[PDB]
DNA sequence: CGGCCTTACTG
DNA sequence: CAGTAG
DNA sequence: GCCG
């Protein structure tokens, strides 16, 4: 639905993002969750006592939601270090995180021009810098579809049986997608092998793939651009998995990230372990049979949720 | 007090 | 391994 | 940050 407390979240997001880019990950996680809670809430919040009651919101956070409701402002925001805007600028480079951002800042850099001419850049960071603007824009769902079909087409040319599905935000039904996450497998349980590498060659020779960021056993993180004019470069992620891990692979890749974390966390409390490979029992333990996503929720004693309902 | 998901690539 | 990322 |  819609957020009934944007006047609150909007202010907290600024602070959460500040801590994030500065390296205070755990505190930033607290705000991130506090924020997620406020958003998905039946109606607007009105009181302190009303705030604390909400899971994910404690005394310190409740206080802040108050200052906002009463002072209409968050004094804390008035003291965010002047290095934050630059740290955010830097970490928006794919391949560069909080540590690299702080280092560059310590060395005197303040702008991308500074980074381009003087900073030391890993191969990935150079690619991220080159597509800085493109990677900041979420693409129209329709374009996400075009990309999925492109990979599926190139893949099925090797084996018409190969199953290709765009997961991530796409499968969750979002209007726009930051990238395209394509899962590839095969019902025969063995044909998925021996393609990955050749598939990337096809897409590469075809001019579709323009830059590679990470190439591994079953995962690929790269960059693509549809043919024709008016096209931006888009991030593309592909994972090839054995059909026996389909349900878990699909569940993982569909996300959301926070949804995955919660689900894995729950599994953990029940003496189980959840990954993109399988759902098991604490130690490794035994692999529980999971033919479908629903089997995962069931085994975890959770009511099934549609992909569109997995925001967190 | 102390975890806060879990796995994988890069160098 | 640390850093970054899905 | 929050929570067990
Ligand atoms: N367990 C886990 N799963 C994750 C994590 N990050 C991502 N995933 C899973 C869940 C996530 O759905 C999937 C794709 O990750 P992206 O493509 O990076 C983010 P998307 O949701 O696709 O939305 P977009 O911003 O692209 O429009 O990997 C993480 O930290 N942990
Ligand atoms: Cl985190
Ligand atoms: Cl360009
Ligand atoms: Mg995505
Ligand atoms: Mn992705
Ligand atoms: Mn471009
Ligand atoms: Mn694996
Ligand atoms: Na609380
Ligand atoms: Na980055």
Q: Would you identify the CATH topology of the domain A138-255?
A: Beta Polymerase; domain 2 (3.30.460)
Q: Is the CB of A211 under 6 A from ligand 1?
A: no
Q: Residues of CATH 3.30.460.10 domain(s) within chain A?
A: 138-255
Q: How far, in Å, are A41, A54, A65 from residue A50 at the CA level?
A: 12, 7, 10
Pairing relation of β-strands A180-185 and A234-240?
parallel
Instruction: Report the DSSP beta bridge partners of residue A240.
Output: A184
CA-to-C1' distance for A9 and B1, Å? 30
Closest CA relative to residue A7, chosen from A33, A55, A63, A45: A45
- A224 with A234: CB under 8 angstroms? yes
Which residue CA neighbors atom 7 of ligand 1 most closely? Answer: A257
- A12 with A34: CB under 8 angstroms? yes
Q: Would you identify the CATH topology of the domain A1-83?
A: DNA polymerase; domain 1 (1.10.150)
Q: Residues of CATH 1.10.150.20 domain(s) within chain A?
A: 84-137
Q: Residue A40: CB partners within 8 Å, gap ≥ 6?
A: A1, A3, A311, A312
Q: Residue A5: CB partners within 8 Å, gap ≥ 6?
A: A38, A39, A41, A44, A45
Does residue A64 carry a catalytic annotation?
yes
- A200 with A224: CB under 8 angstroms? no
E strands present in chain A: 139-140, 163-166, 176-177, 180-185, 209-215, 219-224, 234-240, 272-274, 279-281, 287-288
- A279 with A273: CB under 8 angstroms? yes
The atom number, within ligand 1, closest to the CA of A176 reads 27
- A179 with A224: CB under 8 angstroms? no
Give CA–CA dist A13/A27, Å, rounded: 12
Q: Residues of CATH 1.10.150.110 domain(s) within chain A?
A: 1-83
Q: Residues of CATH 3.30.210.10 domain(s) within chain A?
A: 256-312
- Which entry of A64, A76, A270, A294 is annotated as an active-site residue? A64
Please check whether the domain covering A256-312 is classified as CATH 3.40.50.1000.
Answer: no
Give CA–CA dist A48/A55, Å, rounded: 13
CA-to-C1' distance for A163 and B2, Å? 44
Which residue CA neighbors atom 24 of ligand 1 most closely? Answer: A178
Tell me which method was used to determine the 3D structure. X-ray
CATH superfamily of A84-137: 5' to 3' exonuclease, C-terminal subdomain (1.10.150.20)
Torsion angle of alpha carbons A143, A146, A151, A155, nearest 10°? Answer: 160
Pocket test for ligand 1, best of A165, A166, A168 (most atoms within 8 A of CB): A168
Query: Resolution limit in angstroms?
Result: 2.2
Instruction: Report the DSSP beta bridge partners of residue A184.
Output: A164, A240
Q: Residue A302: CB partners within 8 Å, gap ≥ 6?
A: A263, A266
């Amino acid at each position: 639905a819609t957020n009934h407390n944007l006047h609150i979240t909007e202010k907290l997001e600024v602070l959460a993002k500040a801590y994030s880019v500065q390296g205070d990950k755990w505190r930033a996680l607290g705000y991130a969750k506090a924020i997620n809670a406020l958003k998905s809430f039946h109606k607007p919040v009105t009181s302190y006592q009303e705030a604390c009651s909400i899971p994910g919101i404690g005394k310190r956070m409740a206080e802040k939601i108050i200052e906002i409701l009463e002072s209409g402002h968050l004094r804390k925001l008035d003291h965010i270090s002047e290095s934050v805007p630059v740290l955010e600028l830097f970490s928006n480079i794919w391949g560069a995180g909080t540590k690299t951002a702080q280092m560059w800042y310590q060395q005197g850099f303040r702008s991308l021009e500074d980074i381009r001419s003087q900073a030391s850049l890993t191969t990935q960071q150079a690619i991220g810098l080159k597509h800085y603007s493109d990677f900041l824009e979420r693409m129209p769902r329709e374009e996400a579809t075009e990309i999925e079909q492109t990979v599926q087409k190139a893949a099925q040319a090797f084996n018409s049986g190969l199953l290709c599905v765009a997961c991530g935000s796409y499968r969750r039904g979002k209007a726009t997608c930051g990238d395209v996450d394509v899962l590839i497998t095969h019902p025969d349980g063995r044909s998925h092998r021996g393609i990955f590498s050749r598939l990337l060659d096809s897409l590469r020779q075809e001019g579709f793939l323009t830059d590679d960021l990470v190439k591994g056993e079953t995962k690929y993180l790269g960059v693509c651009r549809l043919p024709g004019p008016g096209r931006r470069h888009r991030r593309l992620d592909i994972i090839v998995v054995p059909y026996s891990e389909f349900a878990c692979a699909l569940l993982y890749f569909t996300g959301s990230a926070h949804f995955n974390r919660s689900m894995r966390a729950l599994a953990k409390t029940k003496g189980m372990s959840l990954s993109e490979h399988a759902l098991s029992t604490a130690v490794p333990g035994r692999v529980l049979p999971t033919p479908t996503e629903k089997d995962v929720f069931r085994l975890l004693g959770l009511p099934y949720r549609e992909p569109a309902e997995r925001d967190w």
